[PDB]
Amino acid sequence: KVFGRCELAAAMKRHGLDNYRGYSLGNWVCAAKFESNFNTQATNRNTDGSTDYGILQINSRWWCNDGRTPGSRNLCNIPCSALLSSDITASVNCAKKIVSDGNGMNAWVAWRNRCKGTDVQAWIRGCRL
Ligand code: NA
């Protein structure tokens, strides 16, 4: 499933991401746009053998287990397959853990690259939230 920005915004708001750890809803929607292009099924292979999974491209070397990544941790204590659901619950739960013990949303390179410091509210304008 590929989310439209407004449908995703509503889902992220439902799961409590609006202002989670101080980051407005727009930041989370923007992150998803440039990380996975709002695609819940997207995956990306990396040079270290890890793979990024889902709507928020969560990495298997640190956050989830796919059993094929050398030197992993699984800090979100979840199989990476759960991060490929049409429902974003699992990804949100892991994202909350990632932003809480880390360097804010800088954990998402695409957010740092394309969202940080910009008019992220543009991602929720025109929406019925
Ligand atoms: Na892992």
Curated annotation (Swiss-Prot):
SUPFAM superfamilies associated with the record: Lysozyme-like
Catalytic activity: Hydrolysis of (1->4)-beta-linkages between N-acetylmuramic acid and N-acetyl-D-glucosamine residues in a peptidoglycan and between N-acetyl-D-glucosamine residues in chitodextrins
Binding site for substrate: D101
Protein's GO biological process: cell wall macromolecule catabolic process; defense response to bacterium; defense response to Gram-negative bacterium; defense response to Gram-positive bacterium; killing of cells of another organism
Superkingdom assignment: Eukaryota
Keywords: Allergen, Antimicrobial, Bacteriolytic enzyme, Disulfide bond, Glycosidase, Hydrolase, Secreted, Signal
The EC number(s) this enzyme carries: 3.2.1.17
Residue intervals of the C-type lysozyme domain: 1-129
Disulfide bond sites: C6-C127, C30-C115, C64-C80, C76-C94
Active-site residues, Swiss-Prot/TrEMBL: E35, D52
Expressing tissues: In the egg white and polymorphonuclear leukocytes.
Pfam family, one: Lys
Record's subcellular location: Secreted
Main location: secreted
UniProt enzyme class: hydrolase
GO MF, any single term: identical protein binding
GO CC terms in record: cytoplasm; endoplasmic reticulum; extracellular space
Comment field (misc): Lysozyme C is capable of both hydrolysis and transglycosylation; it also shows a slight esterase activity. It acts rapidly on both peptide-substituted and unsubstituted peptidoglycan, and slowly on chitin oligosaccharides.
Main function: Lysozymes have primarily a bacteriolytic function; those in tissues and body fluids are associated with the monocyte-macrophage system and enhance the activity of immunoagents. Has bacteriolytic activity against M.luteus.
Assembly description: Monomer.
PANTHER family to which the protein is assigned, alphabetical: LYSOZYME C
Family the entry assigns: Belongs to the glycosyl hydrolase 22 family.
Protein name in UniProt: Lysozyme C
Gene name for this UniProt entry: LYZ
